[PDB]
Amino acid sequence: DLTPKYTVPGIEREAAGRLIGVLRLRLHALNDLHLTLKHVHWNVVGPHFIAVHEMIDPQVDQVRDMADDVAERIAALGGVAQGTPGALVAERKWDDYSIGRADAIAHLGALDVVYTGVVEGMRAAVEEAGKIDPATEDLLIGQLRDLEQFQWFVRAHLES
Amino acid sequence: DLTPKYTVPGIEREAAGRLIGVLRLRLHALNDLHLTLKHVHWNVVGPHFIAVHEMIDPQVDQVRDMADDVAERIAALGGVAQGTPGALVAERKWDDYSIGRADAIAHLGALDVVYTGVVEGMRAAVEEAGKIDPATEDLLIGQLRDLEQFQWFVRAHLES
Amino acid sequence: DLTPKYTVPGIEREAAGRLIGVLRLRLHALNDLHLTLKHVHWNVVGPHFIAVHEMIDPQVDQVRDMADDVAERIAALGGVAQGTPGALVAERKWDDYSIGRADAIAHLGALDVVYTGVVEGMRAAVEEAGKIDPATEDLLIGQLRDLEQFQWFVRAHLES
Amino acid sequence: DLTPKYTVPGIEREAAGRLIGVLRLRLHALNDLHLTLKHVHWNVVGPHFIAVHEMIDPQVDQVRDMADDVAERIAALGGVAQGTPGALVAERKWDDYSIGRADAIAHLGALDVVYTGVVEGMRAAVEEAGKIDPATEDLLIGQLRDLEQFQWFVRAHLES
Amino acid sequence: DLTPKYTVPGIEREAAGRLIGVLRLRLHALNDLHLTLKHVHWNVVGPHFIAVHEMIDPQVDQVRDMADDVAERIAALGGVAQGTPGALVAERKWDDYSIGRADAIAHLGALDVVYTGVVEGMRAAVEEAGKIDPATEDLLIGQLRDLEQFQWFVRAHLES
Amino acid sequence: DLTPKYTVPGIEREAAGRLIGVLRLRLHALNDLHLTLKHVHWNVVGPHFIAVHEMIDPQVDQVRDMADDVAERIAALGGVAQGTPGALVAERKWDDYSIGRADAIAHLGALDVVYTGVVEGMRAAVEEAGKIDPATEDLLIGQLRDLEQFQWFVRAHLES
Amino acid sequence: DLTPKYTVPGIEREAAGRLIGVLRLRLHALNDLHLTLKHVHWNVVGPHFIAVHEMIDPQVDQVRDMADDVAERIAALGGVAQGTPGALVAERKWDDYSIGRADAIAHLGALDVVYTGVVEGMRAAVEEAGKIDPATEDLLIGQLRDLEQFQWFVRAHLES
Amino acid sequence: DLTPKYTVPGIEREAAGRLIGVLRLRLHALNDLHLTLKHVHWNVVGPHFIAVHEMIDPQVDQVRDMADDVAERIAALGGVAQGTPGALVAERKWDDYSIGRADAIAHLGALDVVYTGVVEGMRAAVEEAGKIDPATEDLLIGQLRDLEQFQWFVRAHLES
Amino acid sequence: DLTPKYTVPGIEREAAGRLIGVLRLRLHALNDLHLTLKHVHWNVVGPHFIAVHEMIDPQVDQVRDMADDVAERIAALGGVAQGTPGALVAERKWDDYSIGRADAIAHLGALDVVYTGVVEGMRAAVEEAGKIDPATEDLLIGQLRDLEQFQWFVRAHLES
Amino acid sequence: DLTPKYTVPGIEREAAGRLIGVLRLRLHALNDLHLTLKHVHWNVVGPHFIAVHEMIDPQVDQVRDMADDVAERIAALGGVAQGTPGALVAERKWDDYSIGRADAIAHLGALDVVYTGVVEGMRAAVEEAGKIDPATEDLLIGQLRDLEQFQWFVRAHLES
Amino acid sequence: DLTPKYTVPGIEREAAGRLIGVLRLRLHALNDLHLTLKHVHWNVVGPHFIAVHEMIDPQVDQVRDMADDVAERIAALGGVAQGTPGALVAERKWDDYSIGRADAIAHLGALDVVYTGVVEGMRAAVEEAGKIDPATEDLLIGQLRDLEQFQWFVRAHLES
Amino acid sequence: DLTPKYTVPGIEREAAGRLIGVLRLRLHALNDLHLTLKHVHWNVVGPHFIAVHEMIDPQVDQVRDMADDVAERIAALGGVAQGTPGALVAERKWDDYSIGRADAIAHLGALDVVYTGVVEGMRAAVEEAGKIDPATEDLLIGQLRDLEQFQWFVRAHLES
């Protein structure tokens, strides 16, 4: 189904097709996450907005880099790294981020929930990739730890 | 309707609400454009793919910067700079980019059509902004010229 | 009166003298604005002072650069770019910024009022310059948009 | 005549052909100007030559960049950005710069006259472009202001 | 009178209030000095103006940094670092710099007199601070030596 | 007792031994201070934690540099710059910083008390060094002023 | 006991509490290691001291970075990253580094023994973390390899 | 046989000797790979040679860095990191790259076959190292993924 | 005829005049070459245009630097480094580059012929300079080798 | 035999073929030299190994750059720049470097002998190239002097 | 005698003349010191020469900077900063450094004696300047501490 | 006499001893030249002193680099690179630079005479080295051309 014509040496094509499907959905989640982080950066107001900007800037740049790395891994395995928004909205398993112009507590509380979905999805993908290819598993594990640390910074703000 | 509670000094609120609606749709177009440029970068293959990468890299970074500048202008005028993909897909007036894994001619021919839509949309927005606020018109005119030049690089490849 | 002995090619001397008077007062406003921004940076205290520092630092550097560009434009047109404080206090049409040691809300609320005066003054100068010389009008329009965006960051803090 | 086969979206081909002719002559003037500035840098002597070097260095680099931007605009509009010296000498409407080895006053006095021709030519091109395409007009207006400021530095030396 | 509510550990409040008054007037002098240096940079003409620009550029940047350091020292001691021009003009003990558009000799001769006032004021402040707090005395002594060296560069030009 | 076998030229060995003892305890205080600043950075939570991070980062780097400079001065004088934690805990004259996971007010209030101890200790060391060696006194005076300024930033947050 | 109130998504609280205890002791070991490396840098003498400086400089900077990463991981898991020296001395399972002023062979021989303890401790922590959370295991494995390589550089000096 | 006299703490000497043999052959493969990549860079001609240069440059630099990291790991484990060409030619299990001066398709087709051998060899080494030492396995897994991605760029060119 | 009034120490004036004539024509050739390279960069189209841009960019910058070095050598020898286009067109011994908007093969084939003329001219100048002054011969020999290497990159594209 | 189909302008094909043979063997020697320098860097141990690392690092980078320059010169002349190890071992006129894990004196003594062979080979190549083409002779002479200076640093260590 | 015509404000001319004489001899000592440090760098051989290079490089650059600062202070005070070697040899109160080609112990032992003379001379100059001008005293005290620290690095090598 | 015990491969010891004597005197001339350039920088006054500073700064840095390169060449050949001022004054064949505090014309006129001596000395050394070793001749020829160009900048100021 997503089975490629050829793939990376040492991986069977059928197994690569299943890894491609796992990475395709992680790529959707990372693309939706950096769109959401920018949305938060643009629409946060109130006395903590500078702190949200300072926190989110480096996360947006790092999440965009994660997406590039997962996409190029898809391509290497023989798949299509689908990056268009129509496809993302058609295939995702979560709803649009719903906060508009709002203070930091409102945005950060909602972004914490966004990150729970992302990190749980990545933790499931790590388990599936670990059975098919340790190079892709290793890629996902480093990104999972960075995403959990970005979530911790969001949570630390909400603590007390 | 999009009329803000307050806006930039010297601009009437009702006129700001109309400028907000114009910039909201330009922001959708710029967000869809950098998602599309990344999609092309990830999925171009064949003997010209390195040239497409070299052309598209700086365009992705510059288009992401244009989106930030239009979004912060929306925010300053009193509007919501909507950056989520569900809203973009619900409000846009064009279809998803449709090329998957493909050679440079296929991608560049389709990206040329994408850019015609963007530059015509920006040229219309320049005319509307010029009647409401010269600072926003000046922002859009500099971005229009850069987008047309990015389109020229795409077209030059297809020439002959 | 401010009519120069010679001016930039293509501009009449009498019209240049009127543009010189418009830019002389904008230069006073920009000089008073960066003195005021430094005053705020030095005297803000309380739990948001780091956020005020982070916001104001880049504004001070950019406003100092705007002043240099308006001054060199005055010089090119044949006028004196008057930068001394005695003259600024004698010719300005606004009062000294009045907040001493104080928290962010007090400073930012007063700085918002300062910026309304600056941006309204710049918007009036844009209209006058547009009738005399499009190169000077274009200079002022780019600075107006940056000043309005700096005002938005001040306002966003006070929102809610 | 200079009418292109196709041009930037939203501009009629016949109007683009006239804008191409206007930009072609501005490109000749900018190319002759940076050749002339280098000639001055290489052949100025006497007790002010270090000051002429310091003034002219950044102008040469900026004028070379202006030429690239006008040339790429010509190309985008569908025209030939003609950069060879035989064509420049055949089409220009001014004479060769005539000062050889000479002191700063001699060179700067002649370069001031060169710049009057350039800035008047650019001011005329701005008016023509403003009727055909605001993106090209905006390009030329920013270059005009920088050229007038470079002329002011040349004039300031000769003042007294 | 300027006695603070609290001050740096190890310094008595009454003595801190007197040190605050000494630093407040030095801050006025440094603020007026960088406004004056910019005024000179903007309004110097004639065959030595490039040399004045090259000399004054680094002095303006360094004097602005000195002002920040004295202001933050005032703040640490418990005082208001007053940076507005109305207050500077009301409290200063010298007149406005009086040279408009003029050649280097005119400006440099007047700036030399400005610096004599600044360096004598700083030398008096060093003596007063040395009796109250060696950390503030050490700050002022490093700035005094840099200011005297900037004065030497101004004087060297006028020598012969 | 701490009397070295040889020391810097121009200083008597017995006096160097007393200066070594003074610097050894200042080195303990600086080492405990950067360990404490890192502890605060790692364990601050709540809506001001980003501001505490931004404040403490540069202080940690600068305090680590102060420790290196005092240690190398000890070494030059002929002493052992003791940097291990067992020795620091055995020789220090203050208790462990006691705040765990906590908001900015809790940490900053405790860090202010830490800095009072450090700056009073440094002010006493300056007086002792000034009697033995002006080069070591000058080192300590520059560090004292920076530490007091770092304390002011901590205090400014707690003001109101 | 160290069981947190909440932890990273996908990890049980009780298991997180055990991982927190493992990382708390690794953080003590890394903090004691960079204090020890600085102690060696400050107190090495003799004809190989420049080589010890060149070797230890980058290790100190990298070990300080490892400590930050383990501490922020503790914080994300819900624990206290304890960084104070009293606690480190109370909880560690090794003695203070015991070499004072000494040549490279003496220091490097003792530092080799220090590193054996650190790398064995890290190898045990990797095994425990691998059973609880692959993201924390992956963090520790990259640090283990760098620490073993730093130990090799220390050993290579002592070889022959 | 390759059993070292001593090795990294926590690894048995006999097992280290087997890991040394595995890494010795991977080092030969990486050394032959960067020699081969340079050979391709120097001898590619035809209309795609600039694209091959742009692709291969960063690969040569990264492969040279991989070789350094594997060699230093060998050294740490107690082995000889053999880097001379006589030994590489005597011990390798593949033939010399055979393409001389040739177009991109010829070189890239042959380099794809080279990379299949390298990545299969690295995937086998990962499995062997994973049984002996997770730090060396982790090193090899990150290099495997980068090598497979470099192979994908070579393959993408040949696609269609 | 081109005999200078004075020249570099150790060179006879008459011989310097002949070296000046040789360098004057090489300066014309280098000036026409960088004008031609820019012309090619601006007017190349088709599927290889990005590769031509990447090749020509560094050549334009390096050829402009060669021209500066030959011009300053002319000046040092006592001659006029003539840089204006009227003089270049009057004195050159080759025709204007004749390709307008065209694909890479057309431009590169013509640029190869341009470079043959330049490198043969430089090789003749090296022989003449070698008889008059080894410092000028050494300057020309380094530029000849770089020009031949730039020609090789142009030729490599056309190979097959 | 190595006679190329075409070569650099101004050089006869038969003479180019002989220069190609001379440069082909120098390229082998430079390739074997940087492989050997890396081998030494990886396998030096004992109390001077940091000094050998510091000496050899810059030599490896510079020797790799020399190889690129000789290879591109071969290519320009019409030859194959052979970079594979099988060919190097088949064509070289010296034996493999024979020192494994060893102290600095052992490695440096052997590397000195390696460099004698390289510099004598380069000095012979300079004489042959000087008869065929001064641009290639000039390339080799600059590399010879750098290689002799690298040999001096190796020898200086062994002196006494 | 060295009494200047005018001097820095606030210093009597006769006292300035005595300070000029003190700084003139310190400038000789700093000039002779950086000539001597270069001499050592160029002529050290044996197994520690790389360590001497690494130590002396930064000292040469810093000592050259000290000389510039003392010279510009002399100039500001109204004196001649004498930098020629004939004058240095005629006025100095020490002999030429006497070690030629030699190992590190020989050079470092002699350089230690050189530094004792420099630091004792600087300590005497600090005492004399402290009575005339605190700005010059402060300059000399910072340089004294850096020179003593450079001496410590030389001594540390000789320790044991 | 200056015959070394051993020298660079391929050069006879007796010939090396004569080349060492030639380079020893060139090193004296370069050392005296950068001491003289600093002397001029420190003691130039009057309305052109900023221009002299701007000209001389880069020359001092480049002449110091030339001295290092000649000294390391002496060392490689087996000689002593003598850098002390007593030896320079004893062996030089020219007098001390004689201008004290003076305007640019006085200094530049004298520095022009200094450079004539240096460049004539270097031109003689080039001829002698060319007979013994082309690598040393090539070093001296590049330095000669840079020195002549530095002399041209000094002369250009004095022209008219």
| DSSP per-residue string spanning L46-78 | STTHHHHHHHHHHHHHHHHHHHHHHHHHHHHHT
| DSSP per-residue string spanning H95-107 | PPP---SB-HHHH
Query: Where is chain D broken, named by the residue before each break, C–N > 2.5 Å?
Result: none
Pairs of CB atoms within 8 A across B/C:
38
Q: How far is CA H46 from CA E46, H43, I105, in A?
A: 58, 10, 11
C102 bridge partner residues: C44
The answer to whether D147 and D115 have CB atoms below 8 angstroms apart is yes
One-letter identity of residue H156: A
CA atoms of I112 and I89, how far apart (whole Å): 21
The answer to whether E33 and E96 have CB atoms below 8 angstroms apart is no
Provide the 10 A C-beta neighbour count for residue F90: 12
The answer to whether I15 and D48 have CB atoms below 8 angstroms apart is no
Burial of residue A92 (number of CB atoms within 10 Å: 0-12, 13-18, 19+): middle
Tell me which residue of H46, C39, A64 sits closest to E81, measured CA to CA: C39
Tell me which residue of L16, H42, L12, K69 sits closest to L2, measured CA to CA: L16
Q: Which helix or strand (DSSP H or E) is residue D39 part of? A: helix D13-43
Q: How far is CA J147 from CA A129, H102, K43, in A?
A: 50, 32, 19
The answer to whether D148 and C135 have CB atoms below 8 angstroms apart is yes
The answer to whether E61 and E41 have CB atoms below 8 angstroms apart is no
Residues 6+ apart with CB under 8 A from J47: G48, G51, G104, G105, G157, G160, J103
Q: How far is CA I71 from CA D59, I36, I123, J14, L148, in A?
A: 18, 19, 18, 36, 14
- At residue F102, φ and ψ (nearest 5 deg) are -165, 165
A157 min Cα distance to partner chain F (Å) = 4
Instruction: Measure CB to CB from residue K152 to each of F75, F134, F138 and give the nearest one.
Output: F75
Burial of residue A71 (number of CB atoms within 10 Å: 0-12, 13-18, 19+): buried
CA atoms of F56 and H113, how far apart (whole Å): 53
Residue with tokens 């020989």: K106
Q: How far is CA J115 from CA H92, J37, L76, in A?
A: 27, 11, 13
Tell me which residue of I110, I141, I22 sits closest to J10, measured CA to CA: I141
CA atoms of G62 and F135, how far apart (whole Å): 32
Q: Is F80 in Cβ contact with G38 (below 8 Å)?
A: no
Tell me which residue of K132, C42, F146 sits closest to E138, measured CA to CA: F146
CA atoms of C81 and C70, how far apart (whole Å): 8
Degrees (nearest 5) of the Cα angle K80, K82, K87?
A: 135
Query: In chain L, which ranges are E strands?
Result: none
CA atoms of I97 and I32, how far apart (whole Å): 9
The answer to whether A112 and A97 have CB atoms below 8 angstroms apart is no
CA atoms of J54 and J63, how far apart (whole Å): 15
Residue with tokens 């200078």: I4
Closest residue in chain J to residue G53, using alpha carbons only: J50
The domain limits of chain F are 1-160
The answer to whether L87 and K54 have CB atoms below 8 angstroms apart is no
Provide the 10 A C-beta neighbour count for residue G6: 11
Q: Which two tokens stand for residue A102?
A: 């709002």
Q: Is I75 in Cβ contact with D42 (below 8 Å)?
A: yes
Q: Is F46 in Cβ contact with A157 (below 8 Å)?
A: yes
Degrees (nearest 5) of the Cα angle D96, D97, D103?
A: 160
Residues 6+ apart with CB under 8 A from C148: B8, B9, B76, B135, C115, C119
Q: Which two tokens stand for residue C116?
A: 């309304």
J44 bridge partner residues: J102
H residues 74-103 near I, CB within 8 Å? 103
Residue with tokens 């400006």: E107
With touching defined as 3+ CB pairs under 8 A, do chains B and D touch?
Answer: yes
Looking at residue H160, the DSSP 8-state letter turns out to be: -
Tell me which residue of A133, F39, A136, H9 sits closest to G126, measured CA to CA: H9
Closest residue in chain I to residue J5, using alpha carbons only: I159
Provide the 10 A C-beta neighbour count for residue E113: 11
Residue with tokens 């949570």: A155
Cα A84 from chain centroid? 15
The answer to whether G47 and G102 have CB atoms below 8 angstroms apart is no
Degrees (nearest 5) of the Cα angle D112, D118, D120?
A: 100
Closest residue in chain L to residue E159, using alpha carbons only: L46
One-letter identity of residue G22: V
Please tell me what resolution, in angstroms, this structure has: 1.9
Tell me which residue of I149, G101, A19, C69 sits closest to J72, measured CA to CA: I149
Give chain J positions within 8 Å (CB) of K47. Answer: 48, 51, 104-105, 157, 160
Give chain K positions within 8 Å (CB) of G46. Answer: 156-157, 159-160
Q: How was this structure determined?
A: X-ray
Residue with tokens 């008889």: I131
Q: Which two tokens stand for residue B158?
A: 């297809």
Q: Does G47 touch chain A (CB under 8 A)?
A: no
* SS3 at position L84: coil
- Give all chains having 3 or more CB-to-CB distances under 8 Å with chain E: C, D, F, K, L
Cα B151 from chain centroid? 12
The answer to whether A39 and B80 have CB atoms below 8 angstroms apart is no
Looking at residue C82, the DSSP 8-state letter turns out to be: -
Tell me which residue of J21, J141, J144 sits closest to J78, measured CA to CA: J21
Cα B118 from chain centroid? 6
E44 bridge partner residues: E102
CA atoms of G23 and G16, how far apart (whole Å): 10
Residues 6+ apart with CB under 8 A from B131: none
Q: Which two tokens stand for residue G39?
A: 């102690």
Tell me which residue of L32, L39, L30, L1 sits closest to L18, measured CA to CA: L1
Tell me which residue of C120, C112, C118 sits closest to C158, measured CA to CA: C112
Contacts of H90-98 spanning 24+ positions with Cβ under 8 A: H91/H24, H91/H25, H91/H28, H92/H25, H92/H28, H92/H29, H92/H32, H93/H25, H94/H29, H94/H32, H95/J86, H96/J84, H96/J85, H96/J86, H96/J87, H97/H36, H97/H39, H97/H40, H97/J84
Looking at residue C95, the DSSP 8-state letter turns out to be: P
- Is it true that domain K1-160 has CATH number 1.20.1260.10? yes
The answer to whether H14 and H109 have CB atoms below 8 angstroms apart is no
The answer to whether L107 and L118 have CB atoms below 8 angstroms apart is no
For chain L, the residue count is: 160
CA atoms of L89 and L82, how far apart (whole Å): 11
Helix axes A104-130, A49-77, angle to 10 degrees: 20
- At residue I6, φ and ψ (nearest 5 deg) are -145, 165
The answer to whether H122 and H147 have CB atoms below 8 angstroms apart is yes
CA atoms of G136 and E35, how far apart (whole Å): 56
CA atoms of A127 and A125, how far apart (whole Å): 5
* SS3 at position C31: helix
Looking at residue H70, the DSSP 8-state letter turns out to be: H
CA atoms of A37 and A63, how far apart (whole Å): 9
Q: Which two tokens stand for residue E26?
A: 């030095």
Tell me which residue of I47, I61, I41 sits closest to I111, measured CA to CA: I41
Residues 6+ apart with CB under 8 A from B47: B103, H48, H51, H104, H105, H157, H160
Instruction: Measure CB to CB from residue G160 to each of J46, J50, J54 and give the nearest one.
Output: J46
Q: Does B43 touch chain A (CB under 8 A)?
A: yes
* SS3 at position I44: strand
One-letter identity of residue A40: V
Provide the 10 A C-beta neighbour count for residue K36: 25
Q: How far is CA H30 from CA H17, H27, H89, J17, in A?
A: 20, 5, 13, 32
CA atoms of A152 and A146, how far apart (whole Å): 10
CA atoms of J44 and J52, how far apart (whole Å): 8
H44 bridge partner residues: H102
Degrees (nearest 5) of the Cα angle C65, C67, C73?
A: 105
Residues 6+ apart with CB under 8 A from E131: none
Tell me which residue of D121, D150, D98 sits closest to D24, measured CA to CA: D121
The answer to whether H44 and H53 have CB atoms below 8 angstroms apart is yes
Cα J74 from chain centroid? 14
CA atoms of F77 and F11, how far apart (whole Å): 9
Q: Which two tokens stand for residue L8?
A: 């660079």
The answer to whether G45 and G102 have CB atoms below 8 angstroms apart is yes
* SS3 at position H44: strand
| DSSP per-residue string spanning H5-40 | SS-STTS-HHHHHHHHHHHHHHHHHHHHHHHHHHHH
Burial of residue G58 (number of CB atoms within 10 Å: 0-12, 13-18, 19+): exposed
Instruction: Measure CB to CB from residue B75 to each of C123, C144, C152 and give the nearest one.
Output: C152
CA atoms of C32 and E89, how far apart (whole Å): 13
* SS3 at position D3: coil
The answer to whether H37 and H93 have CB atoms below 8 angstroms apart is no
One-letter identity of residue B108: L
For chain F, the residue count is: 160
Tell me which residue of L90, L133, L24 sits closest to K42, measured CA to CA: L24
CA atoms of E44 and D92, how far apart (whole Å): 36
The answer to whether D99 and I82 have CB atoms below 8 angstroms apart is no
Q: Does D135 touch chain L (CB under 8 A)?
A: no
Looking at residue G46, the DSSP 8-state letter turns out to be: S
Q: Which one of F7, F26, F39 makes the best mutation probe of the G interface by having the most chain G beta carbons within 10 Å? A: F39
CA atoms of J69 and C69, how far apart (whole Å): 47
Q: How far is CA L39 from CA K75, K85, K86, in A?
A: 11, 10, 12
With touching defined as 3+ CB pairs under 8 A, do chains E and B touch?
Answer: no
CA atoms of C2 and K105, how far apart (whole Å): 75
Tell me which residue of H6, H132, H144 sits closest to H75, measured CA to CA: H6
Q: Which two tokens stand for residue I35?
A: 């004008």
Residue with tokens 């790259």: H97
D44 bridge partner residues: D102
Provide the 10 A C-beta neighbour count for residue K60: 19
One-letter identity of residue C72: E
- At residue H102, φ and ψ (nearest 5 deg) are -165, 165
Contacts of K24-27 spanning 24+ positions with Cβ under 8 A: K24/K74, K24/K79, K24/K80, K24/K81, K24/K82, K24/K91, K25/K91, K25/K92, K25/K93, K25/K121, K25/K125, K26/K70, K26/K121, K26/K122, K26/K125, K26/K140, K27/K67, K27/K70, K27/K71, K27/K74, K27/K81, K27/K82, K27/K83
* SS3 at position E105: helix
Q: Is C51 in Cβ contact with F51 (below 8 Å)?
A: yes
